[PDB]
Design an enzyme around this catalytic site. Structure first.
Site, PDB file in Angstrom:
ATOM      1  N   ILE B  19       0.828  -1.201   0.000  1.00  0.00           N
ATOM      2  CA  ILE B  19       0.000   0.000   0.000  1.00  0.00           C
ATOM      3  C   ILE B  19       0.865   1.254   0.000  1.00  0.00           C
ATOM      4  O   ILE B  19       0.572   2.220  -0.713  1.00  0.00           O
ATOM      5  CB  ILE B  19      -0.979   0.009   1.193  1.00  0.00           C
ATOM      6  CG1 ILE B  19      -0.246  -0.211   2.515  1.00  0.00           C
ATOM      7  CG2 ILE B  19      -2.082  -1.020   0.985  1.00  0.00           C
ATOM      8  CD1 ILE B  19      -1.170  -0.280   3.729  1.00  0.00           C
ATOM      9  N   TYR B  24      10.214   2.911   8.748  1.00  0.00           N
ATOM     10  CA  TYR B  24      11.091   1.829   9.180  1.00  0.00           C
ATOM     11  C   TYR B  24      10.906   0.566   8.338  1.00  0.00           C
ATOM     12  O   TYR B  24      11.610  -0.425   8.570  1.00  0.00           O
ATOM     13  CB  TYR B  24      10.863   1.511  10.671  1.00  0.00           C
ATOM     14  CG  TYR B  24       9.415   1.471  11.123  1.00  0.00           C
ATOM     15  CD1 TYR B  24       8.690   0.286  11.071  1.00  0.00           C
ATOM     16  CD2 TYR B  24       8.782   2.603  11.625  1.00  0.00           C
ATOM     17  CE1 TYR B  24       7.373   0.233  11.491  1.00  0.00           C
ATOM     18  CE2 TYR B  24       7.466   2.558  12.047  1.00  0.00           C
ATOM     19  CZ  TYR B  24       6.768   1.370  11.980  1.00  0.00           C
ATOM     20  OH  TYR B  24       5.457   1.316  12.400  1.00  0.00           O
ATOM     21  N   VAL B  27       4.757  -0.731   3.961  1.00  0.00           N
ATOM     22  CA  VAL B  27       3.458  -1.125   4.499  1.00  0.00           C
ATOM     23  C   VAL B  27       2.722  -1.938   3.441  1.00  0.00           C
ATOM     24  O   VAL B  27       2.678  -1.544   2.270  1.00  0.00           O
ATOM     25  CB  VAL B  27       2.625   0.098   4.923  1.00  0.00           C
ATOM     26  CG1 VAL B  27       1.420  -0.360   5.755  1.00  0.00           C
ATOM     27  CG2 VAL B  27       3.466   1.126   5.649  1.00  0.00           C
ATOM     28  N   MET B 102      -7.340   0.403   6.363  1.00  0.00           N
ATOM     29  CA  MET B 102      -8.148   1.592   6.115  1.00  0.00           C
ATOM     30  C   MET B 102      -8.261   1.780   4.609  1.00  0.00           C
ATOM     31  O   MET B 102      -7.255   1.719   3.897  1.00  0.00           O
ATOM     32  CB  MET B 102      -7.516   2.823   6.765  1.00  0.00           C
ATOM     33  CG  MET B 102      -7.418   2.741   8.286  1.00  0.00           C
ATOM     34  SD  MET B 102      -8.995   2.680   9.155  1.00  0.00           S
ATOM     35  CE  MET B 102      -9.727   4.236   8.661  1.00  0.00           C
ATOM     36  N   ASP B 103      -9.481   2.002   4.121  1.00  0.00           N
ATOM     37  CA  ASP B 103      -9.692   2.030   2.677  1.00  0.00           C
ATOM     38  C   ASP B 103      -8.846   3.112   2.014  1.00  0.00           C
ATOM     39  O   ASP B 103      -8.181   2.859   1.000  1.00  0.00           O
ATOM     40  CB  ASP B 103     -11.173   2.242   2.372  1.00  0.00           C
ATOM     41  CG  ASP B 103     -12.056   1.195   3.022  1.00  0.00           C
ATOM     42  OD1 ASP B 103     -11.515   0.195   3.542  1.00  0.00           O
ATOM     43  OD2 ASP B 103     -13.289   1.380   3.027  1.00  0.00           O
ATOM     44  N   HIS B 104      -8.860   4.328   2.569  1.00  0.00           N
ATOM     45  CA  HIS B 104      -8.204   5.460   1.931  1.00  0.00           C
ATOM     46  C   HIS B 104      -7.492   6.329   2.958  1.00  0.00           C
ATOM     47  O   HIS B 104      -7.762   6.261   4.158  1.00  0.00           O
ATOM     48  CB  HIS B 104      -9.219   6.314   1.152  1.00  0.00           C
ATOM     49  CG  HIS B 104     -10.059   5.534   0.189  1.00  0.00           C
ATOM     50  ND1 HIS B 104      -9.599   5.160  -1.055  1.00  0.00           N
ATOM     51  CD2 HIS B 104     -11.324   5.059   0.281  1.00  0.00           C
ATOM     52  CE1 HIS B 104     -10.542   4.483  -1.686  1.00  0.00           C
ATOM     53  NE2 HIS B 104     -11.600   4.408  -0.898  1.00  0.00           N
ATOM     54  N   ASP B 105      -6.575   7.156   2.458  1.00  0.00           N
ATOM     55  CA  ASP B 105      -5.920   8.209   3.226  1.00  0.00           C
ATOM     56  C   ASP B 105      -6.345   9.566   2.683  1.00  0.00           C
ATOM     57  O   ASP B 105      -6.548   9.722   1.477  1.00  0.00           O
ATOM     58  CB  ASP B 105      -4.392   8.053   3.169  1.00  0.00           C
ATOM     59  CG  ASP B 105      -3.814   8.406   1.811  1.00  0.00           C
ATOM     60  OD1 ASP B 105      -4.438   8.056   0.789  1.00  0.00           O
ATOM     61  OD2 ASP B 105      -2.733   9.022   1.764  1.00  0.00           O
ATOM     62  N   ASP B 145       3.103  14.589  14.150  1.00  0.00           N
ATOM     63  CA  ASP B 145       3.189  14.429  12.701  1.00  0.00           C
ATOM     64  C   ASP B 145       1.812  14.474  12.065  1.00  0.00           C
ATOM     65  O   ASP B 145       1.498  13.664  11.180  1.00  0.00           O
ATOM     66  CB  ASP B 145       3.895  13.128  12.322  1.00  0.00           C
ATOM     67  CG  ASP B 145       4.524  13.187  10.934  1.00  0.00           C
ATOM     68  OD1 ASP B 145       4.482  14.263  10.302  1.00  0.00           O
ATOM     69  OD2 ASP B 145       5.058  12.150  10.480  1.00  0.00           O
ATOM     70  N   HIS B 326     -15.587   7.918 -17.389  1.00  0.00           N
ATOM     71  CA  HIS B 326     -15.923   8.813 -18.494  1.00  0.00           C
ATOM     72  C   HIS B 326     -16.465  10.143 -17.971  1.00  0.00           C
ATOM     73  O   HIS B 326     -17.516  10.184 -17.331  1.00  0.00           O
ATOM     74  CB  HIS B 326     -16.939   8.160 -19.441  1.00  0.00           C
ATOM     75  CG  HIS B 326     -17.924   7.254 -18.763  1.00  0.00           C
ATOM     76  ND1 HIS B 326     -17.793   5.882 -18.767  1.00  0.00           N
ATOM     77  CD2 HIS B 326     -19.061   7.520 -18.077  1.00  0.00           C
ATOM     78  CE1 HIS B 326     -18.801   5.342 -18.105  1.00  0.00           C
ATOM     79  NE2 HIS B 326     -19.583   6.315 -17.674  1.00  0.00           N
TER      80      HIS B 326
HETATM   81  C1  LIG Z   1       1.643   4.607   6.604  1.00  0.00           C
HETATM   82  C2  LIG Z   1       1.676   4.963   5.132  1.00  0.00           C
HETATM   83  C3  LIG Z   1       0.454   4.471   4.344  1.00  0.00           C
HETATM   84  C4  LIG Z   1       0.377   5.049   2.930  1.00  0.00           C
HETATM   85  O1  LIG Z   1      -0.080   6.393   2.950  1.00  0.00           O
HETATM   86  N1  LIG Z   1      -0.765   4.808   5.088  1.00  0.00           N
HETATM   87  C5  LIG Z   1      -1.718   3.905   5.353  1.00  0.00           C
HETATM   88  N2  LIG Z   1      -2.670   3.733   4.406  1.00  0.00           N
HETATM   89  C6  LIG Z   1      -3.654   2.835   4.609  1.00  0.00           C
HETATM   90  N3  LIG Z   1      -4.612   2.680   3.680  1.00  0.00           N
HETATM   91  C7  LIG Z   1      -4.841   3.619   2.598  1.00  0.00           C
HETATM   92  C8  LIG Z   1      -4.183   3.198   1.304  1.00  0.00           C
HETATM   93  C9  LIG Z   1      -2.974   3.811   0.888  1.00  0.00           C
HETATM   94  C10 LIG Z   1      -2.370   3.451  -0.281  1.00  0.00           C
HETATM   95  C11 LIG Z   1      -2.936   2.462  -1.106  1.00  0.00           C
HETATM   96  C12 LIG Z   1      -2.337   2.060  -2.331  1.00  0.00           C
HETATM   97  C13 LIG Z   1      -2.913   1.103  -3.102  1.00  0.00           C
HETATM   98  C14 LIG Z   1      -4.114   0.496  -2.702  1.00  0.00           C
HETATM   99  C15 LIG Z   1      -4.715   0.855  -1.538  1.00  0.00           C
HETATM  100  C16 LIG Z   1      -4.147   1.846  -0.705  1.00  0.00           C
HETATM  101  C17 LIG Z   1      -4.751   2.245   0.507  1.00  0.00           C
HETATM  102  C18 LIG Z   1      -3.647   2.077   5.798  1.00  0.00           C
HETATM  103  N4  LIG Z   1      -4.486   1.086   6.300  1.00  0.00           N
HETATM  104  C19 LIG Z   1      -3.937   0.779   7.455  1.00  0.00           C
HETATM  105  N5  LIG Z   1      -2.813   1.500   7.752  1.00  0.00           N
HETATM  106  C20 LIG Z   1      -2.009   1.332   8.960  1.00  0.00           C
HETATM  107  C21 LIG Z   1      -0.580   0.993   8.621  1.00  0.00           C
HETATM  108  C22 LIG Z   1      -2.131   2.517   9.886  1.00  0.00           C
HETATM  109  C23 LIG Z   1      -2.603   2.331   6.673  1.00  0.00           C
HETATM  110  N6  LIG Z   1      -1.616   3.223   6.514  1.00  0.00           N
END
Ligand SMILES: CC[C@H](CO)Nc1nc(NCc2ccc3ccccc3c2)c2ncn(C(C)C)c2n1
Lengths: 248, 326, 826
Positions: B19, B24, B27, B102-105, B145, B326
């Site tokens: 993801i 460190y 992910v 988590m689906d999105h950030d 942060d 589209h």
């Molecule tokens: C910590 C850095 C990351 C990236 O920014 N942050 C992050 N992003 C999470 N999901 C969002 C996400 C981000 C990127 C993707 C890319 C492709 C497909 C799906 C994606 C989904 C996530 N879920 C759970 N955690 C825990 C680790 C707290 C997470 N930490």
């Protein structure tokens, strides 16, 4: 959720060390030496009292799961202090802990670190973390000694004498397995109770409930005097066994 | 038992993909083979062995096992690579911190430009974030942060804070020396720009205020590349730091050094006049120059904007999943 | 780092705006047409248009308006770009020399503001006292038109009404007055304010707020005698002026949304209105004179004139000649007659201006075996839908194939000497319970026809209610001959089934060549389709046979042939299917770490996936294991519109912000993390929306030297009809052309004084980065058009590198040869 970190005194007859033929006196000696090694090394490095205690608690817990005959105690101690520094945000470089450990240990003792002291220590951090089940947060009697003392009101000098004497008893209890038997809250009460007897103070008078003779019950619920007396007996045993006497 | 962390193997998770890139370790998205739960795995590599297990990871383990709130990310367990049998010295396998997926950030939703927040959507978003920050603050922890990337949103509308790698305990009784460069420049408080080094929990409030304004503009408020340019942009909007509004600014290392072009007047209410009144008042208080006059997390939750927001009515962000092709 | 070159093969053809005025001379009547980044100036004649001048601007033209302030002999032009570059322009001619003067310029972007839903609006006062701009919600920006404001400095007035639909300056007012339709929770309302340059705020306006139609779309400023405004909606047209209020709601306009308006008679008696179905109306203001001598508006009438191309902008010009500026089909000149023809129409087409329209998809095919290639585009929309055959021969030769329905995807099947084209047509719920098409089109005029009888989703039990008059899309696969372009066959897909992807290929050990279509079951209730089909057809002996169908749990957004296997993207999943000896699709392996797998491209065993928001991911098929592996991902977040593979290491993408970028494998393999990071080495603002990337070139390459510094050829189609080409450079050639650009930008004078470096900077609402890794070939190719003094000024102190000679000075004649070779690829 969270692991259980307390054993019964009777259970200490069955540590890995005991079952590999180490007798109770020798394991007790090893625990004192390892704890005091941790204490002395970190004190030389200027480390906070919580950092020293945390390393000591890691150390004591470690040897509930491993034998002293297979894990040299001063390497384990140095590793515990190294990790404790990072956990408590008082970090030190491993090379500096080795340097200090070499200053304080003789040639035979430093033999435990083998040909590459830093490596032996850094390698152990993996086993330490798995052993303590990644439960890094630790509470110590110190914070409760102060939290409870702050609620005492009376002669400033008698209470300060009570605190310092109790504080010393906390430092001395780190050499024992009390850390493995009783929560820190109880330890803090036990040392206040012990200092009170030795100083001929009646602490209840300083509480908000001056006619509540079991003064500690308002700080720590469900603690029988038996427990406080067992803790008091074990602390004073250290003084009687040694040449040292009660601070008073 | 569930508490015996560090022993279970990562074999128990089918790794779906990577993801993101972490501090460190990278992910990964994964699914528990036993339960089918999607989980996020943070790889911790101690093989560098420069100073052992990374403190950044230690902080996150230490703190997140203590913090239990709806708006704080849950660390579920720590798992390991297949360990070398009876050879702890040669074992260089890594550990994985298991988190809820988590689906999105937020950064991703905003940068893609694929989300629109109504007032009600922002109310639900900010209330969860500030309630989470209050939970951390009542427990005396400073995030340090806060950035759109670290705020994580599930499609239902649940908001959770995430990267606690820089978090440390705050003592009001004992002022402690802290690291000056903590937050990303875009979300950094003015006090730290001038080098406080002994900072308050109000640092996280400033960052959340920058996010609040951004949710109404879809663009970060203070975009600069250098610390001085950042102070200039903050000053153009909030007013220049001066004893008139921040009596102790004269104590800060760089106050005399980092002077803005002018002694600007505050225009925050003018440039943000398109913002609803309750929000503008919240923004004005959150983006206060003096950290001792900047509102707390609790005070934001007792505001006209977030006080009467019913959290049951989740109100998700408007994210298109069709007709975007589209 | 990577080095690439981008040139325009066909300039933007869609009309974005048109105005009439006296710009070139106070005497001539001019028509200024604004295609994206291009301004065309014409002079109106009795036969048609005489072209006089065309300029390019380093910015998308958003506002184009003509004004004549007191003291000027002729009209001046205001243009505001989408990046908020403002300027005032003047036409100046010295005999044979024509140039454009930048009278005032500046960037009016605000540090803080929310971009409005209805986009940038720009209007100018009737007295040319100020320029009004609606850029951000809750704000109204005023540029006062004083002689001294050469930098176009401006101020903002707080505007309580946050959601404004349209605003225009009103005629017949004592002081500057704005009329705007706005939306709040209580509906839409029409309100007026006065603008005070002295106080720099609004004052209460001449007439009260009135609630208007919920879908009130446009504001018309009616000139004196009438004054006031006309508000155009979906069902009604209303006139508002103080106490007077009129409303006409003729049933004819309810059928199609009206999108454009233009004034015919300067007195305001007559207006033109156009709608999305291409109809052209006349709006009539019936005058009544009172004994006071004043003229009041008695009534409004709407009269249908005929049909034009679906028009974005309408301009009346003079006589009966109306210019139909179209974005979805060909633009036109049409003549309005007083007498209708025998069919009842008053509109007769004069000229037709080619518009490649929206290029939804395209393919390159060598139809004549010429070793050249021809470009077949899916162009246009709705009744303007067409296929366009494009070849080089110095101009492009373009054949048009009208479809009268929207073309979606195209793929060539040589074995069958025909094209497969996906199309959709609009039908409306009718009183039978079924639907009726508004006009005949390609899918209904096929020689032979078929309809899917698939029973996959037939179990339904999911209710979808229909209301009379609602629109539906009906999707078809068209089989079109490659020589005649006759619709040989039309296959109609299931009700509510959308055809999204199309390939022509052989699979496995099956010698037959199939048309394969990926679909999605689209119901209004669903946020994202949850049902779909992959259908295998065979075109044989004039009939299309359904060979096999595979049910999927999502939308098959993209498919591509992959080493005898079928690679398909279903929502997040990327799947590889095998074709069995039983002629059925069998799943081999899947990839699930996607948000939405909109686009797929392959090369060897490598697969490039384009996500809705997660940019591009490089996957690899591992035959030893029978599964996928993630090679690297672009972790920077971008909304993809198209993707393409340049070579084994470099990958090209197009963003929905009209930007292009190239990512490369990090090729610094010391840590797994570095390898998995695709690094964006190239960034470029094209200014166009790239729907399709296609490998190929249209130049004649057979029996030719065909040698150029550039290597590779990717063509791309855009929404505005623009066709471009991306090609690769060596480090040495990039540096030469880049250093030359910096020299050219100092020499060449920009319209509006827009910095070229600014224009090409990567730009989203949230970021602005300097361009990198891309040479603006349209800038390089302009070296050949600058005067000799300027050429020699450019080459001063210019050195070559990594050549046979380490440092080699350049002359003007040396660079002329180099650029001319670069002009041969486009
Ligand atoms: C910590 C850095 C990351 C990236 O920014 N942050 C992050 N992003 C999470 N999901 C969002 C996400 C981000 C990127 C993707 C890319 C492709 C497909 C799906 C994606 C989904 C996530 N879920 C759970 N955690 C825990 C680790 C707290 C997470 N930490």
């Amino acid at each position: 959720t969270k692991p259980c970190w307390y054993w019964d005194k009777k259970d200490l007859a069955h540590t890995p060390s005991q079952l590999e033929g180490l007798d109770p006196a020798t394991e007790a000696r090893y625990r004192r030496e390892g704890a005091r090694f941790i204490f002395d090394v970190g004190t030389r490095l200027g480390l906070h009292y919580d950092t020293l205690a945390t390393g000591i608690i890691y150390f004591h817990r470690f040897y509930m799961f491993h034998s002293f005959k297979q894990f040299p105690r001063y390497v384990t101690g140095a590793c515990c202090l190294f990790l404790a520094g990072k956990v408590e945000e008082t970090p030190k470089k491993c090379k500096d802990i080795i340097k200090t450990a070499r200053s304080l240990l003789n040639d035979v003792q430093f033999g435990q670190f083998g040909d590459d002291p830093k490596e032996e220590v850094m390698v152990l951090e993996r086993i330490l973390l798995q052993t303590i089940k990644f439960d890094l947060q630790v509470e110590h009697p110190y914070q409760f000694l102060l939290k409870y003392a702050k609620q005492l009101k009376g002669d400033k000098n008698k209470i300060q004498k009570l605190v310092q004497m109790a504080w010393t008893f906390v430092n001395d209890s780190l050499c024992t397995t009390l850390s493995l038997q009783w929560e820190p809250e109880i330890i803090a009460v036990a040392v206040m109770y012990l200092a009170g007897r030795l100083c001929k103070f009646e602490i209840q008078e300083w509480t908000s409930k001056p006619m509540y003779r079991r003064w500690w019950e308002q700080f720590v619920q469900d603690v029988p005097v038996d427990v406080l007396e067992d803790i008091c007996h074990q602390i004073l045993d250290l003084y009687s066994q040694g040449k040292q006497q009660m601070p008073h | 038992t569930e508490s015996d962390w560090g022993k279970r193997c990562v074999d128990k998770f089918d790794i779906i993909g990577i993801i993101g890139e972490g501090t460190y370790g990278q992910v990964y998205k994964a699914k528990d083979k036993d339960t089918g739960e999607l989980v996020a795995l943070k790889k911790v590599r101690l093989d560098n062995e420069k100073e052992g297990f990374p403190i950044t990871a230690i902080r996150e383990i230490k703190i997140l096992r203590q913090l239990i709130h709806r708006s704080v990310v849950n660390m579920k367990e720590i798992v390991t690579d297949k360990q070398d049998a009876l050879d702890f010295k040669k074992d260089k396998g890594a550990f994985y911190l298991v988190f809820e997926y988590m689906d999105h950030d937020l950064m991703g939703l905003l940068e893609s430009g694929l989300v629109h927040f109504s007032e009600d959507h922002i109310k639900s978003f900010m209330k969860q974030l500030m309630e989470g920050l209050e939970y951390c603050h009542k427990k005396n922890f400073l995030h340090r942060d806060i950035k759109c990337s670290n705020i994580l949103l599930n499609n239902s509308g649940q908001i959770k804070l995430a990267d606690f790698g820089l978090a440390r305990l705050y003592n009001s009784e004992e002022s402690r020396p802290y690291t000056n460069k903590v937050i990303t420049l875009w979300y950094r408080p003015p006090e730290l720009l001038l080098g406080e080094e002994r900072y308050t929990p109000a640092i996280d409030v400033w960052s959340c205020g920058c996010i609040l304004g951004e949710l109404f503009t879809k663009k970060p408020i203070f975009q600069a590349n250098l610390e001085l340019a950042q102070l200039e942009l903050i000053s153009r909007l909030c007013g220049s730091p001066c004893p008139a509004v921040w009596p102790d600014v004269i104590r800060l290392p760089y106050f005399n050094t980092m002077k803005p072009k002018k002694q600007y007047r505050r225009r925050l209410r003018e440039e943000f006049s398109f913002i609803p009144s309750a929000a503008l008042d919240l923004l004005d208080h959150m983006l206060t120059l003096d950290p001792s006059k900047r509102c707390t997390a609790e005070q934001t939750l007792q505001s006209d904007f977030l006080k009467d927001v019913e959290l049951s009515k989740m109100a998700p962000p408007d994210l298109p999943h069709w007709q975007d092709c589209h | 780092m990577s080095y690439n070159y981008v040139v325009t093969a066909q300039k933007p053809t869609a009309v974005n705006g048109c105005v009439t005025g006296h710009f070139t001379s106070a005497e001539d009547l001019n028509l200024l047409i604004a295609k994206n980044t291009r301004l065309e100036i014409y002079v109106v004649t009795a036969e048609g248009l005489r072209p006089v001048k065309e300029v390019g601007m380093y910015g998308k033209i958003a506002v184009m308006e003509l004004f004549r302030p007191k003291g000027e002999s002729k009209d001046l032009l205001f243009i505001l770009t989408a990046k908020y570059n403002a300027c005032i322009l003047e036409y100046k001619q010295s005999g044979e020399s024509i140039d454009i003067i930048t009278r005032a310029h500046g960037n009016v972007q605000d540090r803080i503001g929310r971009p409005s839903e209805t986009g940038i609006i720009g209007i100018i006062d009737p007295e040319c006292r100020m320029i009004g701009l609606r850029l951000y919600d809750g704000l109204f920006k005023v540029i006062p038109l004083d002689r001294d404001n050469k930098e176009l400095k401006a101020f903002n007035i707080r505007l309580e009404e946050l959601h404004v639909i349209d605003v225009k300056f009103l005629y017949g007012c004592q002081a500057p007055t704005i009329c705007f339709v706005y939306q709040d929770p209580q509906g839409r309302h029409v309100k007026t304010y006065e603008v005070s340059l002295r106080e720099k705020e609004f004052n209460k306006g001449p007439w009260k707020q009135e609630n208007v139609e919920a879908e009130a779309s446009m504001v018309i400023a009616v000139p004196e005698p009438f004054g006031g405004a006309i508000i155009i909606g979906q069902e009604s047209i209303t006139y508002h002026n103080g106490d007077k209020y009129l409303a006409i709601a003729p049933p004819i306009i309810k059928q199609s949304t009206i999108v454009c308006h233009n004034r015919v008679d300067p007195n305001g008696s007559r207006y033109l209105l156009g709608d999305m179905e291409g109809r052209l109306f006349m709006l009539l203001l019936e005058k009544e004179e009172q004994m006071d001598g004043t003229v009041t508006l008695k009534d409004l009438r709407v009269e249908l004139l005929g049909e034009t191309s679906i028009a974005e902008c309408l301009t009346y010009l003079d006589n009966g000649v109306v210019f139909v500026g179209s974005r979805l089909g060909d633009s036109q000149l049409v003549k309005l007659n007083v007498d209708s023809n025998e069919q009842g129409s008053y509109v007769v087409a004069m000229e037709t201006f080619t518009n490649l329209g929206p290029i939804v998809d395209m393919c390159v095919v060598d139809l004549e075996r010429q070793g050249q290639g021809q470009l077949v585009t899916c162009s246009g929309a709705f009744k303007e839908g067409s296929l366009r055959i494009i070849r080089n021969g110095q101009k492009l030769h373009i054949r048009t194939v009208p479809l009268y329905e929207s073309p979606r995807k195209i793929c060539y099947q040589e074995v069958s000497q025909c094209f497969g084209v996906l199309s959709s047509r609009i039908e409306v719920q009718d009183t039978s319970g079924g639907t009726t098409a508004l006009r005949p089109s390609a899918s209904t005029q096929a020689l032979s026809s078929s309809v899917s009888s698939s029973k996959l989703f037939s179990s339904s039990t999911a209710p979808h209610e229909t209301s009379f008059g609602e629109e539906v899309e009906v999707h078809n696969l068209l089989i079109i001959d490659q020589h005649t372009f006759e619709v040989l066959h039309a296959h109609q897909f299931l009700q509510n089934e959308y055809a999204l992807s199309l390939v022509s290929c052989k699979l496995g050990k099956d010698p037959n060549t199939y048309f394969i279509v990926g679909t999605a079951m689209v119901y209004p209730e669903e946020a994202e389709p949850k049902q779909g089909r992959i259908v295998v057809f065979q075109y044989s002996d004039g009939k299309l046979q359904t060979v096999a169908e595979k049910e999927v749990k999502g939308a098959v957004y993209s498919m591509v042939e992959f080493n005898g296997k079928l690679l398909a993207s279903i929502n997040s999943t990327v799947r590889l299917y095998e074709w069995t000896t039983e002629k059925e699709l069998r799943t081999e392996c899947n990839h699930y770490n996607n948000i939405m797998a909109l686009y797929l491209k392959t090369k060897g065993d490598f697969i490039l996936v384009g996500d809705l928001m997660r940019s591009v991911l490089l996957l690899a098929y591992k035959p030893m294991e029978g599964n996928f592996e993630e090679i690297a991902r672009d972790f920077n977040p971008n909304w993809m519109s198209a993707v393409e593979i340049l070579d084994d290491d470099n990958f090209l993408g197009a963003e929905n912000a009209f930007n292009l970028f190239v990512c490369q494998k990090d090729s610094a393999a010391t840590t797994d993390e570095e390898r998995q990071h695709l690094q964006e080495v190239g960034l470029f603002h094209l200014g166009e929306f790239v729907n399709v990337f296609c490998h190929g070139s249209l130049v004649m390459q057979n029996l030719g030297e065909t040698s150029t510094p550039t290597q590779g050829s990717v063509l791309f189609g855009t929404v505005n009809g623009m066709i471009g080409l991306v090609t690769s450079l060596s480090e040495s050639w990039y540096n030469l052309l880049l250093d030359m650009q910096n020299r050219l930008n100092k020499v060449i004078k920009s319209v509006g004084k827009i910095e070229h470096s600014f224009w090409r900077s990567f730009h989203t609402e949230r970021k602005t980065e300097p361009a990198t890794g891309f040479i603006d070939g349209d800038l390089i190719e302009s070296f050949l058009d600058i005067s000799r003094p300027k050429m020699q000024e450019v080459v001063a102190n210019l050195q070559y590198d990594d050549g046979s000679g380490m440092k080699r000075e350049a002359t003007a004649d040396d660079l002329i040869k180099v650029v001319e070779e670069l002009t041969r690829i486009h």
